[PDB]
Amino acid sequence: QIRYPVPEESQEGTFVGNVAQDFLLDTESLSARRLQVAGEVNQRHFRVDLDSGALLIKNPIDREALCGLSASCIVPLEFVTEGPLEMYRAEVEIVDVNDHAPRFPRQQLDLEIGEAAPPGQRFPLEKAQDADVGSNSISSYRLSSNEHFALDVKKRSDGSLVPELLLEKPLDREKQSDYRLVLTAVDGGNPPRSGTAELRVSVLDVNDNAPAFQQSSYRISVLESAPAGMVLIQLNASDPDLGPSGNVTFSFSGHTPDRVRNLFSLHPTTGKLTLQGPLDFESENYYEFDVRARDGGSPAMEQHCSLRVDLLDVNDNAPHITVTSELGTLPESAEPGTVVALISVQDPDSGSNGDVSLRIPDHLPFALKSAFRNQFSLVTAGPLDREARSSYDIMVTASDAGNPPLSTHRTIFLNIS
Amino acid sequence: QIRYPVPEESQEGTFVGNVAQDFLLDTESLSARRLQVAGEVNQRHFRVDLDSGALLIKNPIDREALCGLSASCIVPLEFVTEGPLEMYRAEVEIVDVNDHAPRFPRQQLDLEIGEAAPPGQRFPLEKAQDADVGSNSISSYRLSSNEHFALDVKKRSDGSLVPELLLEKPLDREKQSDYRLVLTAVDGGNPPRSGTAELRVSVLDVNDNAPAFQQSSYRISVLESAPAGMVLIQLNASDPDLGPSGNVTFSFSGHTPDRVRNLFSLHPTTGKLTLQGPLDFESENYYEFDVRARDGGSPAMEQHCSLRVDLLDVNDNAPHITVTSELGTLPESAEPGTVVALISVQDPDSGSNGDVSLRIPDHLPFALKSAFRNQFSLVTAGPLDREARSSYDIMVTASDAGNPPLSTHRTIFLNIS
Numbered sequence: 064q065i066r067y068p069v070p071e072e073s074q075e076g077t078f079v080g081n082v083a084q085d086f087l088l089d090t091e092s093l094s095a096r097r098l099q100v101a102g103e104v105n106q107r108h109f110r111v112d113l114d115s116g117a118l119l120i121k122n123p124i125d126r127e128a129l130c131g132l133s134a135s136c137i138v139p140l141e142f143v144t145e146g147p148l149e150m151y152r153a154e155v156e157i158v159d160v161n162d163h164a165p166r167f168p169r170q171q172l173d174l175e176i177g178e179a180a181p182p183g184q185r186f187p188l189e190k191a192q193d194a195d196v197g198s199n200s201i202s203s204y205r206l207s208s209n210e211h212f213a214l215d216v217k218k219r220s221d222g223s224l225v226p227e228l229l230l231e232k233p234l235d236r237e238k239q240s241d242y243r244l245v246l247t248a249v250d251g252g253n254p255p256r257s258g259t260a261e262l263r264v265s266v267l268d269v270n271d272n273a274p275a276f277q278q279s280s281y282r283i284s285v286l287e288s289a290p291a292g293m294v295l296i297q298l299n300a301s302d303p304d305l306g307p308s309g310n311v312t313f314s315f316s317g318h319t320p321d322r323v324r325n326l327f328s329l330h331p332t333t334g335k336l337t338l339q340g341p342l343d344f345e346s347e348n349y350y351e352f353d354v355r356a357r358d359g360g361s362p363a364m365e366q367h368c369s370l371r372v373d374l375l376d377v378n379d380n381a382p383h384i385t386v387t388s389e390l391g392t393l394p395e396s397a398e399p400g401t402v403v404a405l406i407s408v409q410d411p412d413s414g415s416n417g418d419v420s421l422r423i424p425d426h427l428p429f430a431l432k433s434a435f436r437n438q439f440s441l442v443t444a445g446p447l448d449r450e451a452r453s454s455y456d457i458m459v460t461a462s463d464a465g466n467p468p469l470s471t472h473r474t475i476f477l478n479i480s
Numbered sequence: 481q482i483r484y485p486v487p488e489e490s491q492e493g494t495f496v497g498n499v500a501q502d503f504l505l506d507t508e509s510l511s512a513r514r515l516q517v518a519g520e521v522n523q524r525h526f527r528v529d530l531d532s533g534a535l536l537i538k539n540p541i542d543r544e545a546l547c548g549l550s551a552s553c554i555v556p557l558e559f560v561t562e563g564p565l566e567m568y569r570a571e572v573e574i575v576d577v578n579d580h581a582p583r584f585p586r587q588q589l590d591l592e593i594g595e596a597a598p599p600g601q602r603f604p605l606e607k608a609q610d611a612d613v614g615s616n617s618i619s620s621y622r623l624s625s626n627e628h629f630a631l632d633v634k635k636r637s638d639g640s641l642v643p644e645l646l647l648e649k650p651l652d653r654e655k656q657s658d659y660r661l662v663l664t665a666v667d668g669g670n671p672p673r674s675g676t677a678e679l680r681v682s683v684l685d686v687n688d689n690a691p692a693f694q695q696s697s698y699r700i701s702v703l704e705s706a707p708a709g710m711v712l713i714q715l716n717a718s719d720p721d722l723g724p725s726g727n728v729t730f731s732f733s734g735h736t737p738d739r740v741r742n743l744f745s746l747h748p749t750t751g752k753l754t755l756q757g758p759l760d761f762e763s764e765n766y767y768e769f770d771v772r773a774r775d776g777g778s779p780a781m782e783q784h785c786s787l788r789v790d791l792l793d794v795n796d797n798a799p800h801i802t803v804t805s806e807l808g809t810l811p812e813s814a815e816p817g818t819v820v821a822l823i824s825v826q827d828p829d830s831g832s833n834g835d836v837s838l839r840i841p842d843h844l845p846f847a848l849k850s851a852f853r854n855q856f857s858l859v860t861a862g863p864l865d866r867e868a869r870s871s872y873d874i875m876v877t878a879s880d881a882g883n884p885p886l887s888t889h890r891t892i893f894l895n896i897s
């Protein structure tokens with residue numbers, strides 16, 4: 064048929080075509096025939112010049128508002144004359160111009176993705192809008208360089224592009240929690256027009272880290288004389304997760320025997336291990352037990368650590384003197400060398416702290432004899448006369464080889480008859 | 481020195497040794513010398529027979545209560561005589577018997593392990609107790625066959641065994657949530673004695689599964705006449721996690737345009753997509769949008785699904801008759817063939833539903849002429865005489881080719897002069 068191209072957004076009065084000449088109307092009859100555009104809308108947008116017979120633009124036309132996403136926009140125009148009454152038809156092709164840039168409906172997009180999202184999961188993106196059609200519509204999407212995310216641009220049945228964010232590699236909030244990316248959409252105009260949007264993705268924390276001790280195990284030496292309330296060690300553990308999932312508390316293992324809990328206490332927040340009671344190298348020389356650090360996650364991650372506390376001997380025991388047997392009363396006629404008492408000594412300490420020596424004052428008529436290790440018998444070493452002295456109080460003194468030495472004193476009472 | 485072996489837990493009166501004969505004491509002097517055990521404890525456990533001079537057990541001896549975990553248990557015994565007063569020493573070796581079976585302090589142990597525990601993490605176990613020493617103490621640990629856990633048995637500085645549970649492969653509560661294992665501890669006695677304990681481990685859930693749609697995408701066809709409240713589709717998605725982490729809810733994507741939300745609604749629990757308003761094939765022929773299923777986990781996992789709804793044309797529009805120009809009044813002298821009116825018809829439906837035919841009753845002196853598609857002019861087809869009839873009401877009827885057809889009626893009023 065008769066087709067006139069005219070670009071959209073053309074100014075008022077732009078020449079479309081000589082409709083009178085294409086309808087073969089006589090020039091001299093323009094004022095009588097009263098050629099008019101039919102249709103209220105087309106009379107709003109088109110008019111016929113009465114003098115030349117040319118079809119002119121009255122009000123500028125928006126192709127986007129007229130045809131939307133249709134590929135071709137052709138507007139059939141109807142014309143009317145009188146005398147005689149006649150109708151004519153012609154087609155105006157409205158040509159699209161590139162007066163729309165791609166534009167994201169939101170220029171700021173925010174995503175919250177869980178740290179444990181599986182690779183391959185997809186996330187929708189808002190496509191930019193370009194009201195044009197054909198080569199002037201959106202032609203490509205671009206995603207800035209990053210290491211975990213890529214673009215998966217989808218082609219719809221009509222030719223629309225749909226960008227999707229594809230997680231390619233697993234995330235880790237503990238290494239990087241925020242990503243700032245730019246998404247760009249470009250049309251195929253000349254020159255190409257484009258628009259961008261900032262996509263801020265934050266990684267939500269999963270409790271995927273257990274607490275970590277500074278060392279795998281600790282070994283401690285402490286003197287058995289250490290006072291109650293002494294800090295033996297401060298355990299340090301870190302947990303990189305966020306919030307309560309990064310909150311560390313310390314405790315004894317659940318199966319920790321009572322003999323350990325009675326002597327040691329562990330501060331739940333600071334991890335300071337303190338001493339709660341008396342230690343004794345003589346009964347127990349070392350303790351090994353496990354402690355644990357738990358985070359406040361759901362479910363909780365825990366890590367255990369092995370502790371060994373070695374005790375150091377202190378010279379805290381003086382010798383103990385036991386008089387096994389005692390004559391008590393003795394006749395003055397007894398010959399020198401008579402065994403008067405049996406004495407055993409013991410010292411629970413080790414090394415020089417437990418080596419016992421025994422002594423009595425010299426001026427007495429008695430002597431100490433030893434036939435077995437740490438065993439002494441007290442015997443008569445001189446003559447005895449009841450009339451001179453009727454009774455003896457013999458002071459025996461035991462000493463260990465500690466520094467300073469510890470001494471024990473015991474008196475054996477002996478009557479003479 | 482003088483050493484006598486005697487087994488622990490020996491009955492009263494068991495022969496240890498002839499101490500008198502080893503101390504070279506005369507048999508005839510037993511009642512006078514009054515050989516006695518020294519020490520209250522040893523007098524509780526040992527006695528000397530006055531007639532034979534043999535050292536005998538008074539009360540049975542527990543080696544475990546005496547030496548604990550020491551490798552060697554040797555008890556120095558002291559003896560005393562009178563007339564003259566003398567002291568002797570000898571050593572009794574108490575030999576351990578295998579009168580203790582390994583026994584776990586708890587025979588039921590329960591562990592709660594997070595599903596996302598990393599392989600290589602270790603978990604303490606309560607070691608069994610065997611009060612014996614040497615080869616009679618605990619000699620081995622065994623863990624029943626399973627696929628995720630193994631045993632890491634530790635050797636302490638003193639020779640104690642510490643069993644630890646080692647996670648070798650990652651867990652998955654969604655495949656198996658409970659493990660029943662038996663831990664066995666065996667000593668090295670003849671015969672070996674052993675004891676077992678049941679360890680029930682439960683796997684605590686992590687929200688590591690997103691909801692899964694039945695299909696990756698759905699495509700729906702619906703007639704534009706479908707009534708409001710019609711269910712177009714029921715979306716089904718499953719989530720295998722536990723509790724709220726397995727609770728699925730449905731929604732439109734956050735970026736879903738308002739033109740979609742106005743026409744369709746999605747039940748958050750059931751996933752039924754219903755129709756909320758009028759559809760119109762003539763203005764919009766299809767809709768594509770994304771819906772998402774989110775679980776109630778922290779953080780939430782989500783999965784999207786693409787929906788496309790195609791509309792089907794219904795013959796819901798009758799033709800529209802527009803009378804472009806109308807003479808209104810006509811002289812009776814006008815020749816036949818005079819164009820009286822200009823008529824244009826349009827039907828927005830497609831195919832046969834939008835093909836228009838036009839007609840008027842036959843007996844009238846008028847006719848319909850068509851020079852362009854869907855355009856008709858009403859012209860005079862016979863002679864006219866005002867005196868016969870002074871005015872005409874001409875009923876024009878348009879019909880589409882639908883089943884059933886839709887009709888439009890319009891009357892043009894024409895005066896004759």
Ligand SMILES: *[C@@H]1O[C@H](CO[C@@H]2O[C@@H](C)[C@@H](O)[C@@H](O)[C@@H]2O)[C@@H](O[C@@H]2O[C@H](CO)[C@@H](O)[C@H](O[C@@H]3O[C@H](CO)[C@@H](O)[C@H](O)[C@@H]3O)[C@H]2NC(C)=O)[C@H](O)[C@H]1NC(C)=O
Nearest residue numbers: 276277278280281282294295296297298299300333334335
């Ligand atoms: C557990 O941690 C505490 C605290 O350590 C703190 O964090 C670490 C990472 C470092 O930055 C450290 O400087 C911080 O205080 C440890 O306590 C500290 O341990 C130091 C040994 O590396 C120790 O030197 C320091 O005490 C000082 O020592 C100086 C002599 O070297 C003295 O002149 C001074 O007066 C202090 O007495 C100590 N500080 C405190 C406040 O405790 C602790 O050792 C860690 N535990 C384990 C088992 O490693």
Ligand SMILES: *[C@@H]1O[C@H](CO[C@@H]2O[C@@H](C)[C@@H](O)[C@@H](O)[C@@H]2O)[C@@H](O[C@@H]2O[C@H](CO)[C@@H](O)[C@H](O[C@@H]3O[C@H](CO)[C@@H](O)[C@H](O)[C@@H]3O)[C@H]2NC(C)=O)[C@H](O)[C@H]1NC(C)=O
Nearest residue numbers: 693694695697698699711712713714715716717750751752
């Ligand atoms: C979403 O799920 C529903 C419900 O499905 C239920 O779970 C699945 C795993 C099956 O066990 C199913 O039997 C359960 O009802 C689906 O609804 C059902 O879909 C069936 C198609 O597979 C459909 O046949 C059924 O309707 C019946 O159809 C029969 C004729 O084949 C009729 O004779 C009968 O009267 C029903 O009209 C329907 N049932 C219900 C209660 O809806 C639904 O299709 C799924 N959606 C998608 C998109 O797959």
Ligand SMILES: *[C@@H]1O[C@H](CO[C@@H]2O[C@@H](C)[C@@H](O)[C@@H](O)[C@@H]2O)[C@@H](O[C@@H]2O[C@H](CO)[C@@H](O)[C@H](O)[C@H]2NC(C)=O)[C@H](O)[C@H]1NC(C)=O
Nearest residue numbers: 306307308309310311312313330331332357358359360363
């Ligand atoms: C980190 O946690 C501590 C301790 O939490 C306790 O142990 C948890 C495993 C769980 O059992 C909680 O219910 C316990 O509260 C928090 O310290 C507490 O702070 C409050 C004051 O706000 C105080 O009244 C409590 O007594 C404290 N708990 C203890 C055991 O002393 C601490 O607030 C947490 N850290 C942060 C940053 O919130």
Ligand SMILES: *[C@@H]1O[C@H](CO[C@@H]2O[C@@H](C)[C@@H](O)[C@@H](O)[C@@H]2O)[C@@H](O[C@@H]2O[C@H](CO)[C@@H](O)[C@H](O)[C@H]2NC(C)=O)[C@H](O)[C@H]1NC(C)=O
Nearest residue numbers: 723724725726727728729730747748749774775776777780
């Ligand atoms: C599964 O969840 C539903 C819905 O939970 C809602 O959506 C969540 C994502 C979150 O926003 C919640 O705060 C919402 O409640 C539960 O259904 C609810 O049940 C209560 C009665 O107990 C009812 O009053 C609410 O209205 C319901 N919610 C809706 C949206 O209708 C349901 O109980 C959960 N399943 C289980 C097994 O607990």
Ligand SMILES: *[C@H]1O[C@H](CO)[C@@H](O)[C@H](O)[C@@H]1O
Nearest residue numbers: 247248249255256257258
């Ligand atoms: C968007 O991208 C286009 C081409 O990629 C540029 O021409 C424009 O300046 C904007 O950066």
Ligand SMILES: *[C@H]1O[C@H](CO)[C@@H](O)[C@H](O)[C@@H]1O
Nearest residue numbers: 170245246258259260261
């Ligand atoms: C893409 O980048 C431009 C700046 O070049 C912004 O204007 C836009 O908002 C988006 O960040």
Ligand SMILES: *[C@H]1O[C@H](CO)[C@@H](O)[C@H](O)[C@@H]1O
Nearest residue numbers: 664665666672673674675
């Ligand atoms: C424990 O194990 C020992 C040897 O392994 C057995 O002898 C005993 O019967 C029990 O099963």
Ligand SMILES: *[C@H]1O[C@H](CO)[C@@H](O)[C@H](O)[C@@H]1O
Nearest residue numbers: 587662663675676677678
């Ligand atoms: C090991 O197995 C035995 C049964 O043979 C139980 O007695 C014990 O409690 C543990 O289950």
Ligand SMILES: [Ca+2]
Nearest residue numbers: 125126127162
């Ligand atoms: Ca425009």
Ligand SMILES: [Ca+2]
Nearest residue numbers: 160161162195
């Ligand atoms: Ca345009």
Ligand SMILES: [Ca+2]
Nearest residue numbers: 163195199250
């Ligand atoms: Ca454009």
Ligand SMILES: [Ca+2]
Nearest residue numbers: 235236237271
């Ligand atoms: Ca991590």
Ligand SMILES: [Ca+2]
Nearest residue numbers: 272304308358
């Ligand atoms: Ca943590």
Ligand SMILES: [Ca+2]
Nearest residue numbers: 268269271304
């Ligand atoms: Ca984390």
Ligand SMILES: [Ca+2]
Nearest residue numbers: 343344345379
């Ligand atoms: Ca002591």
Ligand SMILES: [Ca+2]
Nearest residue numbers: 344377379412
């Ligand atoms: Ca000591």
